[PDB]
Amino acid sequence: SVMEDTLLSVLFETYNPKVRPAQTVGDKVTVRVGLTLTNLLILNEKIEEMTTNVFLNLAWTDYRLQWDPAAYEGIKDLRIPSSDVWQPDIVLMNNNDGSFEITLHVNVLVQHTGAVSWQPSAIYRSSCTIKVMYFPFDWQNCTMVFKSYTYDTSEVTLQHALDAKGEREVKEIVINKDAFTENGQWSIEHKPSRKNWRSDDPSYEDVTFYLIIQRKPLFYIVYTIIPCILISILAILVFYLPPDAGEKMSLSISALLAVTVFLLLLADKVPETSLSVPIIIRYLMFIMILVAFSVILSVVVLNLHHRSPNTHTMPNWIRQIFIETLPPFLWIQRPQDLKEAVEAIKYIAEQLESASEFDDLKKDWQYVAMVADRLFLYVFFVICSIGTFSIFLDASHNVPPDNPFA
Amino acid sequence: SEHETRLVANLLENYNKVIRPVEHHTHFVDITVGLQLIQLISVDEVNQIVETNVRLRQQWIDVRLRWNPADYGGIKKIRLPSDDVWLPDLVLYNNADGDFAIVHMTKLLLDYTGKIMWTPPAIFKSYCEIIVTHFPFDQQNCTMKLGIWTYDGTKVSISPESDRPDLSTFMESGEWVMKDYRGWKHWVYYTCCPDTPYLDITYHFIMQRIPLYFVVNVIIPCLLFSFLTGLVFYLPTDSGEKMTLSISVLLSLTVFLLVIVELIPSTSSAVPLIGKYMLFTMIFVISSIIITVVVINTHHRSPSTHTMPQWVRKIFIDTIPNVMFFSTMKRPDVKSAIEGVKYIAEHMKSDEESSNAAEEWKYVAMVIDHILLCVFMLICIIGTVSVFAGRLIE
Amino acid sequence: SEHETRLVANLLENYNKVIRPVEHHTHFVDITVGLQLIQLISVDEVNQIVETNVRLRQQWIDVRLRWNPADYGGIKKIRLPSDDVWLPDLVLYNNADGDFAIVHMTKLLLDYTGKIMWTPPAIFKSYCEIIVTHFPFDQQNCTMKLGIWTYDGTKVSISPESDRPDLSTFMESGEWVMKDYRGWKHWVYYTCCPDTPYLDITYHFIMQRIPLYFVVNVIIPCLLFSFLTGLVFYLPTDSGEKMTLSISVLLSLTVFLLVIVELIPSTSSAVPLIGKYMLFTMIFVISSIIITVVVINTHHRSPSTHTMPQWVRKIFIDTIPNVPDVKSAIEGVKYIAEHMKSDEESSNAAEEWKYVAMVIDHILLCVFMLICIIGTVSVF
Amino acid sequence: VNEEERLINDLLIVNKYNKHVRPVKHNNEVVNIALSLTLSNLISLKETDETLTSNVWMDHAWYDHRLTWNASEYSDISILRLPPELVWIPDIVLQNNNDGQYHVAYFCNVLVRPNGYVTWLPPAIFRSSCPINVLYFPFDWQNCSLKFTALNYDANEITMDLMTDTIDGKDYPIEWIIIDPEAFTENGEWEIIHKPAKKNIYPDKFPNGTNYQDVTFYLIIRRKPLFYVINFITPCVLISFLASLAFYLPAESGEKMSTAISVLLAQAVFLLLTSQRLPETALAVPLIGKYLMFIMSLVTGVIVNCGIVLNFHFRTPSTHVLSTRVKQIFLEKLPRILHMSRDEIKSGIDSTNYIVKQIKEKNAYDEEVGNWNLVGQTIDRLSMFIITPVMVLGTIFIFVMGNFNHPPAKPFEGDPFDYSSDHPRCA
Amino acid sequence: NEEGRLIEKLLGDYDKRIIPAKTLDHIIDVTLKLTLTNLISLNEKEEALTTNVWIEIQWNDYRLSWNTSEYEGIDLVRIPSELLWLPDVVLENNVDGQFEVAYYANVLVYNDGSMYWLPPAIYRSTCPIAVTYFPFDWQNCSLVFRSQTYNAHEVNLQLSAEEGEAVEWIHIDPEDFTENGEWTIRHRPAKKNYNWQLTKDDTDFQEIIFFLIIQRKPLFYIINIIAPCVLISSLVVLVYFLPAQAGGQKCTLSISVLLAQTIFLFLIAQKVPETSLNVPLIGKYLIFVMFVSMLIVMNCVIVLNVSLRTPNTHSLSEKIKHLFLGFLPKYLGMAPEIKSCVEACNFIAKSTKEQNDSGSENENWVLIGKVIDKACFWIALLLFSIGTLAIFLTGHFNQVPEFPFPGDPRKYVP
Ligand SMILES: CC(=O)OCC[N+](C)(C)C
Numbered sequence A: 001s002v003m004e005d006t007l008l009s010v011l012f013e014t015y016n017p018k019v020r021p022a023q024t025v026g027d028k029v030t031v032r033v034g035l036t037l038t039n040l041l042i043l044n045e046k047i048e049e050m051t052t053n054v055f056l057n058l059a060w061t062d063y064r065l066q067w068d069p070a071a072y073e074g075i076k077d078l079r080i081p082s083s084d085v086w087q088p089d090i091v092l093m094n095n096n097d098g099s100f101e102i103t104l105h106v107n108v109l110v111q112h113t114g115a116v117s118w119q120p121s122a123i124y125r126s127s128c129t130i131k132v133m134y135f136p137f138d139w140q141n142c143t144m145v146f147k148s149y150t151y152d153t154s155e156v157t158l159q160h161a162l163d164a165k166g167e168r169e170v171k172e173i174v175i176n177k178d179a180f181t182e183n184g185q186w187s188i189e190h191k192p193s194r195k196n197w198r199s200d201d202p203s204y205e206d207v208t209f210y211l212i213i214q215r216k217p218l219f220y221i222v223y224t225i226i227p228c229i230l231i232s233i234l235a236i237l238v239f240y241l242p243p244d245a246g247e248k249m250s251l252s253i254s255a256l257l258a259v260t261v262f263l264l265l266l267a268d269k270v271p272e273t274s275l276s277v278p279i280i281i282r283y284l285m286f287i288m289i290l291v292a293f294s295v296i297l298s299v300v301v302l303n304l305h306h307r308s309p310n311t312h313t314m315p316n317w318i319r320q321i322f323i324e325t326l327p328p329f330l331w332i333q334r335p336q337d338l339k340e341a342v343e344a345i346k347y348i349a350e351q352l353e354s355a356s357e358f359d360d361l362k363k364d365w366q367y368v369a370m371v372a373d374r375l376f377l378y379v380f381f382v383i384c385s386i387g388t389f390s391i392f393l394d395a396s397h398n399v400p401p402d403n404p405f406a
Numbered sequence B: 001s002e003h004e005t006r007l008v009a010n011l012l013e014n015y016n017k018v019i020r021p022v023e024h025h026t027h028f029v030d031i032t033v034g035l036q037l038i039q040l041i042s043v044d045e046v047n048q049i050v051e052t053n054v055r056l057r058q059q060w061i062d063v064r065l066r067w068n069p070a071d072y073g074g075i076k077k078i079r080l081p082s083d084d085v086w087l088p089d090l091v092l093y094n095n096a097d098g099d100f101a102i103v104h105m106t107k108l109l110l111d112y113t114g115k116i117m118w119t120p121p122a123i124f125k126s127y128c129e130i131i132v133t134h135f136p137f138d139q140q141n142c143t144m145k146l147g148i149w150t151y152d153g154t155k156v157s158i159s160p161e162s163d164r165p166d167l168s169t170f171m172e173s174g175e176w177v178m179k180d181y182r183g184w185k186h187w188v189y190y191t192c193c194p195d196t197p198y199l200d201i202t203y204h205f206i207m208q209r210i211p212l213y214f215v216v217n218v219i220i221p222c223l224l225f226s227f228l229t230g231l232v233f234y235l236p237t238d239s240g241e242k243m244t245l246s247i248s249v250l251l252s253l254t255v256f257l258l259v260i261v262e263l264i265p266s267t268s269s270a271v272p273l274i275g276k277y278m279l280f281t282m283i284f285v286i287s288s289i290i291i292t293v294v295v296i297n298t299h300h301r302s303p304s305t306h307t308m309p310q311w312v313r314k315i316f317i318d319t320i321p322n323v324m325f326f327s328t329m330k331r332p333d334v335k336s337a338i339e340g341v342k343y344i345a346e347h348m349k350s351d352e353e354s355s356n357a358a359e360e361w362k363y364v365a366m367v368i369d370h371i372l373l374c375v376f377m378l379i380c381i382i383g384t385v386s387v388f389a390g391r392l393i394e
Numbered sequence C: 001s002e003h004e005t006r007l008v009a010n011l012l013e014n015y016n017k018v019i020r021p022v023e024h025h026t027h028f029v030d031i032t033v034g035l036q037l038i039q040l041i042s043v044d045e046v047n048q049i050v051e052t053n054v055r056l057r058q059q060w061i062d063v064r065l066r067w068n069p070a071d072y073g074g075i076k077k078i079r080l081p082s083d084d085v086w087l088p089d090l091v092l093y094n095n096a097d098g099d100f101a102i103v104h105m106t107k108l109l110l111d112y113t114g115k116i117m118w119t120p121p122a123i124f125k126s127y128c129e130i131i132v133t134h135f136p137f138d139q140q141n142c143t144m145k146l147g148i149w150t151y152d153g154t155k156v157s158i159s160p161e162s163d164r165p166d167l168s169t170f171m172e173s174g175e176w177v178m179k180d181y182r183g184w185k186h187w188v189y190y191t192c193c194p195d196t197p198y199l200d201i202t203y204h205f206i207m208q209r210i211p212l213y214f215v216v217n218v219i220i221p222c223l224l225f226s227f228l229t230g231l232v233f234y235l236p237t238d239s240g241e242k243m244t245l246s247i248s249v250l251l252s253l254t255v256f257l258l259v260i261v262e263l264i265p266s267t268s269s270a271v272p273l274i275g276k277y278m279l280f281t282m283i284f285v286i287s288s289i290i291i292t293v294v295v296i297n298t299h300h301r302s303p304s305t306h307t308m309p310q311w312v313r314k315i316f317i318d319t320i321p322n323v324p325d326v327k328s329a330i331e332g333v334k335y336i337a338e339h340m341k342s343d344e345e346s347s348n349a350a351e352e353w354k355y356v357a358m359v360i361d362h363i364l365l366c367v368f369m370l371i372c373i374i375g376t377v378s379v380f
Numbered sequence D: 001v002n003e004e005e006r007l008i009n010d011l012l013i014v015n016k017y018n019k020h021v022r023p024v025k026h027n028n029e030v031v032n033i034a035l036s037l038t039l040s041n042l043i044s045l046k047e048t049d050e051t052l053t054s055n056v057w058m059d060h061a062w063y064d065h066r067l068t069w070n071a072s073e074y075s076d077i078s079i080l081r082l083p084p085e086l087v088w089i090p091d092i093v094l095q096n097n098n099d100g101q102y103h104v105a106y107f108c109n110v111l112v113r114p115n116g117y118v119t120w121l122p123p124a125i126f127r128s129s130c131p132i133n134v135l136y137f138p139f140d141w142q143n144c145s146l147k148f149t150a151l152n153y154d155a156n157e158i159t160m161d162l163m164t165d166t167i168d169g170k171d172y173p174i175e176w177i178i179i180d181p182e183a184f185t186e187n188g189e190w191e192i193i194h195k196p197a198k199k200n201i202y203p204d205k206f207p208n209g210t211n212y213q214d215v216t217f218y219l220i221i222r223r224k225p226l227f228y229v230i231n232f233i234t235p236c237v238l239i240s241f242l243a244s245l246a247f248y249l250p251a252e253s254g255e256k257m258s259t260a261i262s263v264l265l266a267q268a269v270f271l272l273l274t275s276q277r278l279p280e281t282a283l284a285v286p287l288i289g290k291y292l293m294f295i296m297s298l299v300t301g302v303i304v305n306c307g308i309v310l311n312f313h314f315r316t317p318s319t320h321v322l323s324t325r326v327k328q329i330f331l332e333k334l335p336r337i338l339h340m341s342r343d344e345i346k347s348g349i350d351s352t353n354y355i356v357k358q359i360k361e362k363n364a365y366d367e368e369v370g371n372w373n374l375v376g377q378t379i380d381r382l383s384m385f386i387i388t389p390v391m392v393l394g395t396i397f398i399f400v401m402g403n404f405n406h407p408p409a410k411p412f413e414g415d416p417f418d419y420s421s422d423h424p425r426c427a
Numbered sequence E: 001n002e003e004g005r006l007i008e009k010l011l012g013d014y015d016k017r018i019i020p021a022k023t024l025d026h027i028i029d030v031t032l033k034l035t036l037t038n039l040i041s042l043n044e045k046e047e048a049l050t051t052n053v054w055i056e057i058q059w060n061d062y063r064l065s066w067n068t069s070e071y072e073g074i075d076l077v078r079i080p081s082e083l084l085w086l087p088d089v090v091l092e093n094n095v096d097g098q099f100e101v102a103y104y105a106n107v108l109v110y111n112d113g114s115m116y117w118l119p120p121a122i123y124r125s126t127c128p129i130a131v132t133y134f135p136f137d138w139q140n141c142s143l144v145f146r147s148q149t150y151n152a153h154e155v156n157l158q159l160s161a162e163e164g165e166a167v168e169w170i171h172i173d174p175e176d177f178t179e180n181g182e183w184t185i186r187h188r189p190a191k192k193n194y195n196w197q198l199t200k201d202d203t204d205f206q207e208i209i210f211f212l213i214i215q216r217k218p219l220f221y222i223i224n225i226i227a228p229c230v231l232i233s234s235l236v237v238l239v240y241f242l243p244a245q246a247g248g249q250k251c252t253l254s255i256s257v258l259l260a261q262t263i264f265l266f267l268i269a270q271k272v273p274e275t276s277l278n279v280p281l282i283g284k285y286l287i288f289v290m291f292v293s294m295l296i297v298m299n300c301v302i303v304l305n306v307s308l309r310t311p312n313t314h315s316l317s318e319k320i321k322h323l324f325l326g327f328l329p330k331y332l333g334m335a336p337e338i339k340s341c342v343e344a345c346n347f348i349a350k351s352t353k354e355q356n357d358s359g360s361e362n363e364n365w366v367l368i369g370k371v372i373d374k375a376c377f378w379i380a381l382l383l384f385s386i387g388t389l390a391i392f393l394t395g396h397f398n399q400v401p402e403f404p405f406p407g408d409p410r411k412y413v414p
């Protein structure tokens, strides 16, 4: 028969996959752990879970799996099913669901010197703490913690994987260009790898891989930011409509309704984490409060416009502060039967004079309203511009650090 | 190791994993059970199911799995798959949409004295009744009941490792603060087997909800719309937009009520705080709309049909505006042509009288508007306090 | 019993479940396949996937599994796990979201003459194209193609148990009515093995949708807003709420169109009739909005700017509705009189414009009434 | 008795068949595996999570010298069926899946022949990661891909290939996805334009690795846009016409801003629905998304212009000055360019003079208000004539550009071969 | 430990594929009891009832008997259920593929061969929802247990007996039981049902059904859905006091109330199932108030047309004016210079008189609109009140039946 079958029969005569390959009692099996990312599928912020398609580059040395290739027709290496050989239980301790082990269970590669290399593929759903302060113009620092579930430091010794030539250690996530599909929403800025030790327990040792991925905010800018900028532009416009036209309140509360709808429909995107408030949510709340104040001031302007001498008397201070001082600054400055017939015509003239004085005071009230809404227009324009510029400047300044801390 | 290989072959050669690890059948297996909370995954309020990532640390002593280390090259601790040895049948009593027991079956530590240290992972999706009385500032007491299913206290006994669950490596959830946590052990006599008690350990976590997210995304817009509810009384009737503002506030509160229902369970044990607030502000908006309709109808009372009552005038013109001071309220054939002049003058006088009466009606409506403005501002400022500060004081 | 244990030990002592149950390899296993629909779980219209709970009754004869009852205490029927005997690999060809084959592996009856009656439960999520042409009053012809995968006609043959699937234990779905059901057997030559035919049985169910739920939730509000569309014309221009009503109706119809879109698959095989009705009523609402802004602009025509055409005047007025200081004071009085005359004639021309607006509104209302009455006639 | 039992026993138990050993006579040899795909139903393509769910048949074919028998010696048995768990099979897996389903769904029997030829045709449901190019949505075409690689062996031990068919005694490779007319169903939303099959070898990798080779099946499928045109594009276009139509409303009725804002809100609702229907990728803004953004910006411009018209209409001579330049450019030049439609007695006499003066002032006020109204009307007319053609041209240009997004005639750039089933490569 | 020797003796020659009948025609009696630990949820959308129950199955296996004197007084052992024969009692009423129990706990085996298997289970059982009186409804959900493999000639399903009498109800242990908070268990009967269409050699001939007559607690739905819907739908009554002028916005208010009712319809559609057998009670109320709102919008259009019409467009007939002014209000409470000056003054007076006379008919039309508004206000108020009261009265009178079975005088309670 094939000498491969003979070699497999000889190797696994007394092999036990439940036993560590410590040649001497007390030895530690040096296990090299590396990661090869093929696709970063999604980062679900709602459940704080990142799922990736990865290859686990594992390597160790088993003294039992040794043979002389010269005595077996030049067989330098074999491909053995992964269940037939001992393997360290390198699992994802950071997994959000109950998916610790790998998925594919590919064959291991056993060489005649005893070196075993195993590269299983798996879809791993790890848990990532989401820093939501600068969402969506932000970056996330998502980790994958890999260590043997059972064997501690006294039994295995985790290390870093080697490169293709093997002369050095690679301290980063290996990305194969021929198989990597770049995610359309996240760009991998830094992908370092480091070994962490915890104090107060020397038996702990793990290898963690970091993905400092920066979100591309074009989707949220197009579908949420620009419509809200248009709505705020409308909110500013409501202090330019005449109070005579009965469309001021309709515009103001329609803007408020639009902002509320955009805030509510954003709830399925923003995570439920309560540590901080996302900067887009802060912007939406700023616009909502500004539009609410615009509604209140539009109500005030409409109330001032419809006043009359029959309802209100003009205060001295209001007139002095709104007709004299503000319009210079705002450039809004305004520019027998004959006896009975005679008595009737005189009464008509008296009524016309009274009506003229009445509408003169009414026009004074309307002019006070006009000055008030022009001042509110300038103030709201300045406040909205400054707030929007400051918020977006702070969002733009948020960049990942130049060097990771690993 | 050849030594470890010989040891594992010797341990499982005549080992039966069906039988309890006791020297005599009258004795009981002493098992030390400890819960180690790792991560609070989610708290589903609608389904009343809490998902947690735990490590169910269990220890017991198996006499059949002891060896002398000097006969095996000095090995003192080995590791075996859990499927090769007897395991306690620890079951989550209050499981809901999950697995009742351990399914992963990872390996376990085993020293030379027979002591077994098994720490399998588990995602416990457990039912716990969610008290929505003080939502979203609520505090939930979620429990996890663990007990041996088929063995009673005289056969297999458990004991908590410590009075509190282990949270040394607990990952911060970012939505709940672990205010307290403890574990109590009970002897329960069930109707199925009343002769012997069945032991269990119930780990309860007192979780306090961080309310910032719900305050920002729900409570603040509702507060804004409640503020704008009473603002319609400062809007003059002549604008013809009072109904627009009121009905827009009503539609906003309807949409937010639709939002709230999907966030809380449909349980009827107790009315929620936010539900009471929503009902209060809904009644507030309905009352404001009704009063607005009353004011608008008062503003358009035709003087030719509705004469001004004496008491209405006395109340709303003479006394009340004089009382308030915060607002600036007022406190030949040529004779045919002459006959036409007389007719148009009399028409002018009658129109002036009618306009004066209409002005009186509008003034009454405005006074009613100011009174209702003050009353509704006071109600809006005291009702929100009465709803929220009762819980915020703690 | 001791007899049954001895019998089962004897039957499977040298039994190989790989090999077909034929005396000679040239023969074929005759398998009687029937379906028993237990409950239609749901019909996912958007995903075009129908999940059903079924019992896949299968019968065949195994020569190797026969015994004489007199040698075993008189037992004539036993039950064995399905994993211990040869099983046909019935595979759902059009599986879309579940398992191609049977996965439960329940026990099967075994007669002393070798007859095997196996009734394993399964849930079949099968893809069937959903004809949305007459939604929500439509009927769906959803099929379930069951055939033997790896064996051809000359190796294992199947035959339907009866011309119709069994529905004796079928429970009422509450959303579909089982109008008709029948099974057919086919001989299909695939490209993989063109030299031999492969047999299959396709069970089709004709399910008529019960339309009460969609009538209540969708059709009735749409009819309400469609009726409110015609009340725009009767609404006077001076109220200033014509465009409010028209816009509200249009937005409501758009929202319901979006809901209907969410309720149907995005396949473009055929436009739904409810979709056509929504599109036509939106077209009608848009046309009424155009006509009502025309009538609003007409009502506000300043007579000092727009002169009344003669043809408009006749066609909307005559035919269709029939179907020192003393002399300065005197000069001021004359000026007042002539200005009053000018105002009177300007108001007369404005009233002519308003009359044209009213008659345009009336003829539009009559057109809407005609559309409504012919629609109610076509309903009858 | 059945001779198949004797033959199977002789093949497996007597010969001591090992399913964990490659079927080669020497270790240095290679095993040729022929792979083919048979698409029976394109189940769905969910753009929200970039998943292509397909119902396919995987055709494997390889030789195994351990499964050879003399047919005449075994009573003329020409074919056998064996379960996969009894014989060696190449573990071809889908590398680019979204879930844990690397393998096929059902492990059907393999078919072996006396010459050693083994054919395995299991059905499968695969959810591969298809990057969605949303640039020309909904008139788009997607270049989805299924990547199959043999991770259990390296290229020196297993060589993947494309299955070969024979016509007129000549062998040609099957470089396409096989579609069986009697077992294929049209999706109803996606039309299969191209379906090439390629064998990829990466020269920068080493032959002794598991990433040296793969076989990829591509599905270049275009979306039939009739559903989206009828249900989304048409109401968007119809509602957007009302925005430019709002200029025709007179300023007297308070429904100008109401109509414009309502159109804006409807456009925003459609934009939110489109965002719900599309993934959150930032590679490019969709065509319909760009159209909606353009329409919303133009409607916002219409709202601003309506506010300006309302401000100009309600101006009063007691609060503003009708300047000469504005008058001469808004009622002399622009309306013509746009072709728009065109003692007791002494006391009584003093009272009459006063009332005549008041009527004169009222008439002058009315004339000023009328001039402001004409200014507002001509601004409305100018904005309509400058915005309506922009809307029409933008809509027509966007939809023509979307409609002309035909998928390319050849599936791969620089490759003259069309990868069509009717044109074999070497036959 | 003698348990090892005993279990190795019992399972040494034991196979789990054989029903433990002593002789031919011996029927194994299998008794069932259900212990409802917690009614988790009743998902209306998929018509699934999720319950956390302990199902107690008892039968007799003669192969599993031993003499206690030979095993040091051991009379009870625990054997994993995977190593023993089971009667395969499954839930035939499931919504998914889960027929068997979730955990497969150990089986208590007594020295006389009695088997006591009590595994925990989470059962998702179908039950159609009677939406006719939502949300005041009561659901008659049930769980059907049948032997998946054996028939009535091989096993005999029965209800367990405690003190010589059958149980015939879902047992509820006072320890470890939690109220659902939305559903109250009014009745929990149990009986063995025969399907007489089949013969006693078929597997589905005999069943054991545990019923659950659960009544919904409607306080949550009243406070969160019904009361806001009623308060909003009462605002269409207010549209008759708004003026019929350009302001007031009668049509705006009525249309917006109709829109709010549509929002509530969408909200309720996410609660009730998609089944088409009946219209929900609150759905009927919503349809009724939608029709009332549409009629009120039509009436607003009518009164706007009547109030805003002028004598220059319509003719005010004396019949209509008399009918709406004397009948309905009776029931309801409601020298060339001199010549030119004379001609100019006469023209001014005539024009003023004509203007004042024309406005008189406008006021008459306003009064007609007011009278129609008052009458239609009373009609609409009466209609809305009667509809609301009748709907909620027939919801309130949806009493749970006194007996678990209408034709059975038994109470089926412990
Ligand atoms: C004894 C048996 O098998 O049932 C266990 C019941 N429980 C969980 C109440 C102890």
Ligand SMILES: CC(=O)OCC[N+](C)(C)C
Pocket: C148, C149, C150, C190, C192, C193, C198, D108, D109, D111, D119, D120, D121, D122
């Ligand atoms: C021959 C084989 O194994 O595949 C069968 C494919 N089918 C069902 C289309 C004939």
